[PDB]
From a paper:
The Omicron sub-lineages harbor multiple mutations in the S protein compared to the original strain (referred to as the WT strain), which mediates receptor recognition and facilitates membrane fusion with the host cells. Despite the extensive mutations, all these Omicron subvariants still utilize ACE2 as the host receptor. Binding of the receptor-binding domain (RBD) to the peptidase domain (PD) of ACE2 triggers conformational changes in the trimeric S protein, leading to exposure of the fusion peptide and facilitating membrane fusion with host cells. Hence, we characterized the ACE2-bound S protein structures derived from BF.7, BA.2.75, and XBB.1 subvariants.
The BA.5 sub-lineage further evolved into BF.7 and even BQ.1.15. We then employed single-particle cryo-electron microscopy (cryo-EM) to determine the structures of trimeric S proteins in complex with ACE2-PD. Similarly, BF.7 carries mutations F371L, S408R, L452R, F486V, and R493Q compared to BA. The monomeric human ACE2-PD exhibited binding to the RBDs of BA.2, BA.5, BA.2.75, BF.7, and XBB.1 with binding affinity (KD) of 4.80 ± 0.01, 3.2 ± 0.03, 1.2 ± 0.01, 4.1 ± 0.02, and 16.2 ± 0.03 nM, respectively. While the increased affinity of Omicron BA.2.75 and BF.7 subvariants for ACE2 may partially explain their enhanced transmissibility, it does not fully account for the prevalence of the XBB.1 subvariant.
Numbering used by the authors:
A (entry chain C): 736 to 826, 854 to 930
B (entry chain B): 590 to 621, 640 to 676, 690 to 735
C (entry chain B): 931 to 940, 944 to 1146
D (entry chain C): 1028 to 1076
Write the structure that this text describes.
C-alpha cells in the first residue's frame, strides 16, 4: 500500500498536512515489505530442499507399484500431475498493489517432481548425500524393518501389498 | 491510469555504478537501449539472455538479474543441476568411503531490554 | 574444524538483523519528538511562551495525542518482534537438548548428513552450533537379489544386502562396502524359493559341516 | 515434515499420519503443500496365552 496515495490521494492540500505527522508512513511500508520478503523465504524453505533435479527412468516400472497419478503429466504446459491438477481446480485501486511470487508454480511443480523421483529411485540416500539407486521392492523391505516387521513378510506378500497401495 | 512502484537494481557501488530500473506492473509502452517486458513490470537497462543461471537478484515471476555479461542482465533462475539416477530392477550403489563434515548454525536467543 | 575458523575469520547476518531492527525502531521513536502533528511548534517551551493558558491547552493536546500514538506503535511492534525471538530461542533450546546432549535420528535437524555430534559456542545474542556429520562417498554399483535359494530354501540377510561383483555373491552392510561370504551365521531362512521374485541360486556355506568333519 | 517424512522414515508417533510411517509423497497446492502419508496398520488379531 502506498500510504500517501491511500490517505490524501491526488489532492495536494492533504499531502502538506500529512507531512506533519513524521515517519508514520515510512514505518508502514517497511512493515509491509518485510512481510512480502518473508513469503518467498517460506516457499524456498519448504520446496527447494534438493540439490539436483532428479528424473525417473523411462521404462517406469518399479516392481509393480504404480505411481502414475502422482508423477508429472508430459502432455501439459504446466507439467503437473493428475492430483496436482485436481488440487488447483478446487482452490488496480487506491494505492494497493499485488506483487508476484519469485517462483512460478511451474517451478514449484518441478521441485516436487524431483523430490518424488529422488524418493522412488533412491529411498532416503539422496537426503543425506549423493543419490544411490536401489530397487523399489528392496527399499520397501528396508522400511518394513524400520517399523519392526521382518523383511520376508514383504517379499512373500509383495503383490497384495502393491494392490493395497494402488487401491488406496 | 497508471501508477506503480519504481525499483533500482544495482550490483553494488563497490563493483560498478551502472543501474537497472523496474517499473512495477506497468506496461512498458507508457514509461516516459534495453526495454524488456516482464510479468512483474517493465525493466530498463538490462539485456535479456537465453542462458539460465542460479538466481542472483530476484526480480519476480521466475526472472532474476545479475551483473555478468559488464552490466546488468535478466533471465530465469536455475532450480539446480541435473542428476540422473541409473535405476534398474536389480542394481544397487554402495559407498566405499566417507567424509567427516562440520557445519554451523546460528540462532538468536535474546534481544535488548529497554524501558 | 580448521576451515570453520578461516570462513569466519575472513555470515552472522541473522544476529546482525535483530540488532539493526531494534536500533532502527529506537531511532524512529526519538525522531518523532520533533514533529508538530498539527501544532505551532514541537517545543513545549514555545507553546508556553507565545500563548495564554486557554490557547496552549489546545496546542499541547495535539502533541500529546501524536506522541501517545507513536509510543504505542513502538510498544506493539516490540511485542510482535519478541514473539518471534521467543520461538527461535525455543528451537535453540531443543537443539541443545537433542544435538548436544544426544545423537539425533531426525533428518536434517542437526546438520546435513548423518548426525554424529554437536558442539555449542556462544555468540553476542545467540548461539552457534557446530554439527559434525558423516557423509558417504565414492559409490560403486553392484547387482543385487532379495534372497538366495539353496537346498530348496530361501535365505535373507540378517543385517545387510546381498551383492555380486560380477561372478561372486557376498553380504555387505548397507552404508559401507565390506563384503563377506554368505553363511548360515549372517542369513536366516523362511520358506521355499518359489514365492519370492528375484531369487538367485547360490551356495550358503555351513561352518560346522566341514570343520567337524 | 518435508525433511523428516519425505527425506526419511520417522519414528515420531503421529507426525506422519496414523499407523507406522512407511513413506510420504509431496504434492504442490496453491499457496500450500499436500503430504500423502503411507502407513502400515495391523489387522485381524488373535488372542493367545
Ligand atoms: C496405474 O493406474 C492407472 C489407474 O489410475 C492405470 O490407468 C488406467 O488403467 C485402466 C485399466 O487398467 C484404464 O481403464 C484407465 O483408462 C486408465 N486410466 C488412465 C490411463 O488415465 C494405469 O494403467 C496403471 N499403470 C500401469 C503400469 O498399469
Ligand atoms: C578415502 O578417502 C581419503 C580421502 O578423504 C583417501 O585418503 C587420501 O589419499 C590420498 C591419496 O593416497 C592422499 O593424497 C590424501 O592425503 C588422503 N587424505 C587424507 C585425509 O589422509 C583414502 O585413500 C580413501 N580410501 C579409499 C579406500 O579409497
Ligand atoms: C552405475 O552404472 C550406470 C549404468 O551404466 C552408470 O550410469 C551411466 O553412466 C554413463 C557414464 O557416466 C552415462 O553415459 C549413462 O547415461 C548413465 N546411465 C545409464 C547408462 O542409464 C553409472 O555411472 C554407474 N555408477 C557408478 C557409481 O559407477
Ligand atoms: C570377485 O571377487 C572375487 C574375490 O573372492 C574374485 O575372485 C578371486 O580373485 C582372486 C584375485 O583375482 C583370485 O586369487 C581368487 O582365486 C579368485 N577366487 C576366489 C574364490 O577367491 C573375482 O575375480 C571377482 N570378480 C570380479 C569380476 O572382479
Ligand atoms: C535354481 O536351481 C534349481 C534347482 O537346482 C533349478 O530348478 C531346476 O531347473 C531346471 C531348468 O529349468 C529344471 O529342469 C529342473 O526340473 C529344476 N529342478 C527343480 C528341483 O526345480 C532352477 O531352474 C535354478 N534357477 C535358475 C535361474 O537357473
Ligand atoms: C480375545 O478374548 C477376549 C475374551 O477374553 C475377547 O473379548 C471378549 O469378547 C466377547 C465377544 O465380543 C465378549 O462377549 C466378552 O465379554 C469379551 N471379554 C471380556 C472379558 O470383556 C476378545 O474379543 C478376543 N479377541 C480376539 C481377537 O479373539
Ligand atoms: C569492496 O571493496 C574492497 C576494497 O575496495 C574489495 O577488497 C572488495 O573485494 C570489494 N567487495 C566486492 C564485493 O567487490
Ligand atoms: C501493452 O500495450 C500494448 C498495446 O495494446 C499491448 O499489445 C501489450 O500486450 C501490452 N502489454 C502487455 C504486457 O500485455
Ligand atoms: C532465444 O531462443 C529463442 C528460441 O525460440 C530465439 O527465438 C531467440 O531469438 C533467442 N534469444 C536471443 C537473444 O538470442
Ligand atoms: C527385471 O526386468 C527384466 C526385464 O529386463 C525381467 O526380465 C526380469 O524378470 C525382471 N526381474 C525382476 C526381479 O523384476
Amino acid at each position: 500500500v502506498d500510504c500517501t496515495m491511500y490517505i490524501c490521494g491526488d489532492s495536494t492540500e492533504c499531502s502538506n498536512l500529512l507531512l506533519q505527522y513524521g515517519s508514520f508512513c515510512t514505518q508502514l511500508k517497511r512493515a509491509l515489505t518485510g512481510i512480502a520478503v518473508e513469503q518467498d523465504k517460506n516457499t524456498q524453505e519448504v520446496f527447494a530442499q534438493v540439490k539436483q533435479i532428479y528424473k525417473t527412468p523411462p521404462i517406469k516400472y518399479f516392481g509393480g507399484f504404480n505411481f502414475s497419478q502422482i508423477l508429472p503429466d508430459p502432455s501439459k504446459p504446466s507439467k503437473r500431475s493428475p492430483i496436482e491438477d485436481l488440487l488447483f481446480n478446487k482452490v488496480k485501486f487506491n494505492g494497493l498493489t499485488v506483487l508476484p511470487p519469485l517462483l512460478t508454480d511451474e517451478m514449484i511443480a518441478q521441485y516436487t517432481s524431483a523430490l518424488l523421483a529422488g524418493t522412488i529411485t533412491s529411498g532416503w540416500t539422496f537426503g543425506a548425500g549423493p543419490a544411490l539407486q536401489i530397487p523399489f521392492p528392496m527399499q520397501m523391505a528396508y522400511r518394513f524393518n524400520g517399523i519392526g516387521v521382518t523383511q520376508n513378510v514383504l517379499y512373500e506378500n509383495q503383490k497384495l501389498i502393491a494392490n493395497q497401495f494402488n487401491s488406496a | 491510469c497508471s501508477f506503480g512502484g519504481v525499483s533500482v537494481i544495482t550490483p553494488g557501488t563497490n563493483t560498478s555504478n551502472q543501474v537497472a530500473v523496474l517499473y512495477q506492473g506497468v506496461n512498458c509502452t507508457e514509461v516516459p537501449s534495453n526495454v524488456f517486458q516482464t510479468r512483474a513490470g517493465c525493466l530498463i537497462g538490462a539485456e535479456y539472455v537465453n542462458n539460465s543461471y542460479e538466481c542472483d537478484i530476484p526480480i519476480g515471476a521466475g526472472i532474476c538479474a545479475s551483473y555478468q555479461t559488464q552490466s546488468i542482465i535478466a533471465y530465469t533462475m536455475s532450480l539446480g543441476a541435473e542428476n540422473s539416477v541409473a535405476y534398474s530392477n536389480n542394481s544397487i550403489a554402495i559407498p566405499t568411503n566417507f567424509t567427516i563434515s562440520v557445519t554451523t548454525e546460528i540462532l538468536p536467543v535474546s534481544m535488548t531490554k529497554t524501558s | 574444524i580448521g576451515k570453520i575458523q578461516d570462513s569466519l575469520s575472513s555470515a552472522l547476518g541473522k544476529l546482525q538483523d535483530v540488532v539493526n531492527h531494534n536500533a532502527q525502531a529506537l531511532n524512529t521513536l526519538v525522531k518523532q519528538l520533533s514533529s508538530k502533528f498539527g501544532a505551532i511548534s514541537s517545543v513545549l517551551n514555545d507553546i508556553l511562551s507565545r500563548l495564554d493558558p486557554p490557547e496552549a491547552e489546545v496546542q499541547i493536546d495535539r502533541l500529546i495525542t501524536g506522541r501517545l500514538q507513536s509510543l504505542q506503535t513502538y510498544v506493539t511492534q516490540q511485542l510482535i518482534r519478541a514473539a518471534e525471538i521467543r520461538a527461535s530461542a525455543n528451537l535453540a533450546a531443543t537443539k541443545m537438548s537433542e544435538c548436544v546432549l544426544g545423537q539425533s535420528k531426525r533428518v536434517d535437524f542437526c546438520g546435513k548428513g548423518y548426525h554424529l555430534m554437536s558442539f555449542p559456542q556462544s555468540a553476542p545474542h545467540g548461539v552457534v552450533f557446530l554439527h559434525v556429520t558423516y557423509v558417504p562417498a565414492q559409490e560403486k554399483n553392484f547387482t543385487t537379489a532379495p534372497a538366495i535359494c539353496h537346498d530348496g530354501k530361501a535365505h535373507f540377510p540378517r543385517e545387510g544386502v546381498f551383492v555380486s561383483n560380477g561372478t561372486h555373491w557376498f553380504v555387505t552392510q548397507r552404508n559401507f562396502y565390506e563384503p563377506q561370504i554368505i553363511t548360515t551365521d549372517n542369513t536366516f531362512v523362511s520358506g521355499n524359493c518359489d514365492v519370492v521374485i528375484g531369487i538367485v541360486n547360490n551356495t550358503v556355506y555351513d561352518p560346522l559341516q566341514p570343520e567337524l568333519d
